[PDB]
Design a protein around this ligand. Structure first.
Ligand SMILES: [Mg+2]
Ligand SMILES: [Mg+2]
Ligand SMILES: [Mg+2]
Ligand SMILES: [Mg+2]
Ligand SMILES: [Mg+2]
Ligand SMILES: [Mg+2]
Ligand SMILES: [Mg+2]
Ligand SMILES: [Mg+2]
Ligand SMILES: [Mg+2]
Ligand SMILES: [Mg+2]
Ligand SMILES: [Mg+2]
Ligand SMILES: [Mg+2]
Ligand SMILES: [Mg+2]
Ligand SMILES: [Mg+2]
Ligand SMILES: [Mg+2]
Ligand SMILES: [Mg+2]
Ligand SMILES: [Mg+2]
Ligand SMILES: [Mg+2]
Ligand SMILES: [Mg+2]
Ligand SMILES: [Mg+2]
Ligand SMILES: [Mg+2]
Ligand SMILES: [Mg+2]
Ligand SMILES: [Mg+2]
Ligand SMILES: [Mg+2]
Ligand SMILES: [Mg+2]
Ligand SMILES: [Mg+2]
Ligand SMILES: [Mg+2]
Ligand SMILES: [Mg+2]
Ligand SMILES: [Mg+2]
Ligand SMILES: [Mg+2]
Ligand SMILES: [Mg+2]
Ligand SMILES: [Mg+2]
Ligand SMILES: [Mg+2]
Ligand SMILES: [Mg+2]
Ligand SMILES: [Mg+2]
Ligand SMILES: [Mg+2]
Ligand SMILES: [Mg+2]
Ligand SMILES: [Mg+2]
Ligand SMILES: [Mg+2]
Ligand SMILES: [Mg+2]
Ligand SMILES: [Mg+2]
Ligand SMILES: [Mg+2]
Lengths: 122, 98, 244, 75, 95, 240
RNA sequence: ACCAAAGCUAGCUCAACAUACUAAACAAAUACAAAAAUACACCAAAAUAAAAUAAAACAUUCACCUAACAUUAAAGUAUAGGAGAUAGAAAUUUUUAUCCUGACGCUAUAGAGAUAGUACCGUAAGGGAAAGAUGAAAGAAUAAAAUAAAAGUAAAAAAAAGCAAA
RNA sequence: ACGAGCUACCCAUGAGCAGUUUAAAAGAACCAACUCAUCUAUGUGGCAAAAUAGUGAGAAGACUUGUAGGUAGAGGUGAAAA
RNA sequence: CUCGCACACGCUUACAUCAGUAACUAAUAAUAUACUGAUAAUUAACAACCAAUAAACCAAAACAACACUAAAACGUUUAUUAA
RNA sequence: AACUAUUCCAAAAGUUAAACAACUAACUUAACAUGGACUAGCAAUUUCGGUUGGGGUGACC
């Protein structure tokens, strides 16, 4: 009676059925029928030099935790744009038209990593 | 257009309630077919002079075929309407003048 | 268990919540009231009271409309508020004979009609009844403006009407670009139907089209929190400057 | 976007990256976000089923209270 | 006979009874004779008379007709000019 | 479900093109025509049925073509011929004695003197003698041949009246046409196709014919020998 | 003496109220052969419900029968009907708030199908189960405690003769 | 509503047919693989909800057969056996 | 005594190693390819996935010389672009 | 009944004379296509009264 419940996988069908397990495509099919890899699609791991740096996978037990404050858009506004805006309004140099000097970005399409359509994996 | 009538009398609902319909209320008898009536005529006011019918500024009665498919599309006539009629009242008063 | 509100009212209270709430009131009031369509196929008796022929007594009498079916191809033309009559008949009209399903279909024609206000010739499927109503109302454009939504029955009729209603409320110059004489002359006779602009673009609309339109007018990209925080900060700084 | 699928459920539809715009896309174009008229009936059933479950979860809890109050009448 | 109607849950009357009989208030039912309009040229004067009568139904029939008829048809009626008002009560019945 | 017809190929080719038989089934999949299916596999040769077809619209005149080969065709009863002129080849339906290495004239030109008719020649009907044998007959001018293409069939030109030709179809019915319509002169190929003897039921299957049904039907009123007066004459001439 | 027996819980049922009415959960993947990131299109649509049955047959007819308008009456009245079976109004009338929500409803063959739309059975639509019982503690199993009562057997084969008893 | 993964008939697309006899791949002949299912005996809650043993009929054809597709119940399909 | 090895389709870990089998699967045992547990395992060269648009080509497969009739599956090259 | 073909009337589009005699009618019809009829095909719904020296035939009611 075949099998209803067990999931549908490349192991199950005929020769003609190949369904990946969910790894991401690195390329396309070329002229010779041979497969071509696109160096840009292959994720390049960015790994910092860890050797000269002191932090460890675990933390000392007598070391204290702290009162837990989730970072909010407000707190981030106040630690960054608030001192600068206050400095330039107190000096009357404040310009409601261009906020770009404070770090505000009008549109995301220029820069490499955009936040809203979210150009980057991790 | 077919004008049709029910064979079974529907009961009443009077308060503004909608009538309670049964399937037997879907049985119709055919009282009339409008398309088979002896057909009426159309009354028009000519804005030019038509060959057979008559002069510019004239009130004529034709069969709806000639009126719909010839005169009205060609701007050779306009409808008998009161607002359109007073125009030719005035035209009749200012014609016989000079 | 029981629903708290009857399911007849779920359509109505669907319109009191969500985006339907934010629709313009005149539109919702055009949808709310369903006026009884002009009798077409059945032929109504005038009086409310009628003397029973057999009984010789005064009898209350009502008019019950005959259910009529409008095939979707009727929405592309103007059929004069008529349609298919689905029903049954007795053969021979003896009640004692077979009872048989029967459908009465309107006779359709291809006719091209001229609209003055929209200045155009449309090729439309119409009935003889539509032509008679156009004749009776003395103009194509008249007939379209002069008749209620229920009596036309066509979505195309309502779109014709929405179009020329817009052309009237706007006094659109593009009607007759060369001759303001003709333009004023035409806009003249129809001056009775002129309605404001906010009203004129909502006339012929399906609830779908309406909801869509209202969704597009409300379309806004959410404002960056940098803006809002900057305005709170300027409020606070201007109240710190004015207090000293 | 919030959409309504064939089954009449209100679903949150995540978007997908495509090299071509949506009206030129075969595969995407043959999905349907909207319900047909029959679906309405089932939607109703869904509600009702849901309502029942909630209804008799509630009645359960209520009952559990009464029992306990006669088991431990420290009030 | 319908003992419990659908809409009202009441007990209907069989109209076919109401058309051919007449219930006095005493409980007597009254009926025309059968075939009294039929083929008159072929019948005796005497027989014709026997037919033209209004007659009473036996007990069994009376109970039957009562069952086939609701309570309304058994009420005491006062009609103006009524031929039958004379006959509604019973007198001198020793039973 | 829905099947798509094999019959879509836009450009004309002399090369044999592959085709799919469908035994009696319409595009819905039900049987429409009984008794059809599974013959031998067949390729299809496209036939040009418009005999007068100027290669380029630049030079309109009557032109001449050479017959290269005369081949068997699976699709029709008549034998067909490969005909080349200018830069183009096409298949045409071969007349009875048409042989390889031959010359055939295609002409639209009329004239007061008619013409001495060879076989492969195509002329407007008006241009032929009044007793001639014709095949591949147009109906309206420019339409292309429909009538009289079967093997060994020939019609005959009967008369010419009022800028119009009246011809006799192989069914012995008369047909009236403008005299500006083209026809080929002669009897179609393979005249003995009538006398061929299918030897065994098998051969019938090879031809893609499935056996008759087995049900017994009593003959009805329709059967008998009906002798009907020959039908009135068909006229494709459109009167003003 | 075996097989067995006994629990009182799991949950349910019916109403009330109620806001208002597609629960929960969504990182990725999901309408390629659902759960398969990535290429030039197509996309979509509606037509009266029918019959079993009642009429002791069946042919017109046959309440309810997935269309909001309730209630007290008018009234099973007027009417409609092979004037049969049956069907059946209206005009006109009546209707006083909110709290006092629970149970002369079930307790594992019952109450939901439900420990579950799972196992299993069907190619599919679809059909659709059964099953629990120690105690305060089993972090008290050389374990301690109250039925030993169904048919079936065992302890214990049978001894002329007969509806098996009287 | 669901069903043509069995089976009836189609459509696409593949695959098989050795030896012998014959000028011959001729719906010829002998006889395997292969396909059928004649006659008998077993079996009859069976090995089997149609089989086993022997025996038979066809075996380059109107042949067998794989894969994918089609036709749907007022229907389909049918070398009619309802 | 002789239905063997492989592939397709299908099945889905039932395969392998170590251990256990009082009872559960084997229509019975011994023990174990089928019961139980733990731990492992099939590695691409084979196979799937793997271009479009124009244009020249009438000329069967049958050891293919050449033919038969029922007229027959199966591609080169040239041009234009092909990450 | 529907459906499929036939035939006809009406609907719809038209076209002609200014008709005839003395001192309004008639005709036309490409494909669709409506209402009402006609003739067939293909069909749809429903039924097989009882008595009987078993039923049936015969007879009877
Ligand atoms: Mg299964
Ligand atoms: Mg696979
Ligand atoms: Mg495999
Ligand atoms: Mg590679
Ligand atoms: Mg052929
Ligand atoms: Mg041939
Ligand atoms: Mg035959
Ligand atoms: Mg026969
Ligand atoms: Mg009955
Ligand atoms: Mg009974
Ligand atoms: Mg019966
Ligand atoms: Mg019913
Ligand atoms: Mg009557
Ligand atoms: Mg009766
Ligand atoms: Mg009332
Ligand atoms: Mg239970
Ligand atoms: Mg249960
Ligand atoms: Mg015992
Ligand atoms: Mg004794
Ligand atoms: Mg198959
Ligand atoms: Mg051989
Ligand atoms: Mg042989
Ligand atoms: Mg055998
Ligand atoms: Mg032997
Ligand atoms: Mg053998
Ligand atoms: Mg043999
Ligand atoms: Mg033999
Ligand atoms: Mg299939
Ligand atoms: Mg039947
Ligand atoms: Mg059949
Ligand atoms: Mg067969
Ligand atoms: Mg037979
Ligand atoms: Mg038979
Ligand atoms: Mg298995
Ligand atoms: Mg193992
Ligand atoms: Mg064992
Ligand atoms: Mg019936
Ligand atoms: Mg009998
Ligand atoms: Mg009898
Ligand atoms: Mg006898
Ligand atoms: Mg006897
Ligand atoms: Mg007899």
């Amino acid at each position: 009676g075949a099998d209803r419940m067990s999931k549908w996988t490349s192991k199950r069908g005929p020769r003609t059925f190949c369904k990946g397990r969910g790894a991401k495509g690195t390329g396309f099919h070329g002229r010779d029928g041979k497969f071509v890899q696109i160096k840009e699609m292959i994720p390049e791991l960015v790994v910092p030099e860890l050797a000269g740096f002191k932090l460890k996978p675990y933390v000392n037990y007598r070391a204290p935790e702290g009162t837990d404050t989730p970072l909010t858009a407000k707190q981030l506004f106040l630690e960054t744009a608030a001192p600068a805006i206050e400095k330039d309004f107190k000096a009357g140099t404040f310009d409601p038209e261009h906020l770009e000097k404070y770090g505000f970005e009008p549109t995301q399409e220029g820069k490499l990593f955009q936040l809203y359509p979210k150009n980057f994996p991790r | 257009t077919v004008i049709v009538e029910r064979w079974w009398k529907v009961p009443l609902a009077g308060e503004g309630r909608k009538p309670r319909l049964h399937r037997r209320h879907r049985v119709y008898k055919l009282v009339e077919d409008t398309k088979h009536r002896p057909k009426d005529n159309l009354e028009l006011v000519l804005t030019q002079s038509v060959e057979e019918l008559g002069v510019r500024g004239d009130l004529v009665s034709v069969k709806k075929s000639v009126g719909r498919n010839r005169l009205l599309p060609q701007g050779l006539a306009v409808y008998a309407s009161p607002e359109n009629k007073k125009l030719f009242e005035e035209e009749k008063l200012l014609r016989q003048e000079g | 268990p029981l629903h708290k509100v009857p399911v007849g009212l779920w359509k109505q209270l669907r319109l009191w919540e969500g985006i339907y709430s934010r629709l313009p009131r005149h539109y919702l009031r055009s949808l709310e009231e369903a006026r009884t369509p002009t009798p077409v196929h059945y032929r109504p008796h005038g009086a409310k009271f009628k003397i029973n022929p057999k009984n010789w007594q005064r009898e209350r009498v009502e008019d019950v409309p005959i259910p009529v079916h409008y095939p979707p191809e009727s929405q592309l033309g103007l059929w004069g508020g008529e349609g298919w009559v689905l029903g049954h008949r007795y053969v021979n009209n003896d009640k004692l004979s077979k009872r048989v399903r029967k459908v009465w279909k309107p006779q359709l024609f291809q006719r091209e009609l001229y609209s003055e206000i929209l200045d155009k010739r449309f090729t439309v499927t119409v009935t003889m009844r539509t032509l008679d109503l156009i004749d009776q109302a003395c103009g194509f454009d008249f007939y379209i403006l002069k008749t209620p939504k229920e009596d036309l029955c066509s979505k195309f009729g309502m779109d014709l009407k929405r179009g020329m209603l817009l052309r009237l409320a706007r006094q659109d110059p593009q009607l007759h670009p060369d001759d303001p004489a003709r333009r004023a002359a035409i806009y003249d006779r129809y001056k009775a139907f002129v309605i404001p602009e906010a009203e004129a673009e909502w006339v012929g609309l399906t609830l779908d089209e309406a909801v869509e339109k209202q969704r597009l007018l409300e379309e806004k990209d959410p404002i960056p929190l940098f803006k809002i925080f900057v305005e709170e900060l300027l409020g606070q700084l201007q109240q710190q400057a004015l207090s000293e | 976007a919030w959409r309504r699928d064939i089954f009449g459920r209100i679903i949150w539809h995540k978007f997908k990256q495509w090299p071509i715009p949506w009206y030129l896309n075969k595969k995407y174009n043959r999905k349907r976000f909207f319900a047909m008229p029959y679906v309405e009936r089932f939607v109703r059933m869904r509600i009702e089923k849901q309502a029942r479950i909630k209804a008799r979860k509630r009645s359960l809890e209520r009952k559990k209270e009464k029992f306990l109050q006669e088991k431990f009448p420290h009030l | 006979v319908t003992y419990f109607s659908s809409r009202k849950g009441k007990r209907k009357t069989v109209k076919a009874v109401i058309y051919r009989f007449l219930r006095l208030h005493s409980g007597l039912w009254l009926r025309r004779k059968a075939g009294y309009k039929k083929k008159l040229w072929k019948k005796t004067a005497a027989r014709k008379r026997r037919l033209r009568e209004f007659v009473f139904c036996n007990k069994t029939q009376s109970k039957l007709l009562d069952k086939m008829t609701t309570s309304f048809w058994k009420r005491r009626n006062w009609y103006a000019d009524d031929p039958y008002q004379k006959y509604q009560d019973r007198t001198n019945l020793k039973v | 479900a829905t099947s798509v017809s094999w019959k879509s190929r836009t450009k004309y080719t002399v090369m044999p093109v592959k085709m799919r038989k469908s035994g009696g089934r319409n595009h819905t999949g039900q049987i429409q025509v009984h008794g059809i299916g599974g013959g031998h596999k067949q390729r299809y040769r496209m036939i040009d049925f418009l005999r007068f077809r100027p290669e380029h619209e630049s030079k309109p005149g009557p032109f001449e073509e050479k017959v290269i080969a005369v081949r068997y065709d699976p699709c029709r009863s008549a034998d067909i011929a490969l005909v080349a002129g200018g830069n183009r080849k096409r298949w045409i339906i071969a007349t009875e004695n048409m042989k390889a290495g031959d010359t055939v004239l295609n002409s639209d030109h009329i004239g007061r003197m008619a013409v001495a008719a060879r076989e492969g020649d195509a002329h407007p009907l008006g241009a032929l003698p009044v007793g001639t044998l014709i095949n591949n007959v147009e109906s309206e001018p420019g339409r292309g041949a429909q009538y009289i293409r079967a093997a060994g069939t020939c019609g005959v030109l009967l008369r010419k009246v009022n800028g119009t030709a009246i011809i006799q179809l192989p069914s012995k019915r008369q047909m009236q046409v403008l005299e500006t319509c083209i026809a080929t002169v002669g009897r179609v190929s393979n005249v003995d196709h009538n006398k061929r003897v299918i030897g065994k039921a098998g051969r019938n299957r090879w031809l893609g014919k499935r056996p008759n049904s087995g049900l017994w039907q009593r003959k009805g009123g329709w059967a008998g020998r009906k002798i009907r007066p020959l039908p009135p004459m068909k006229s494709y001439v459109k009167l003003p």
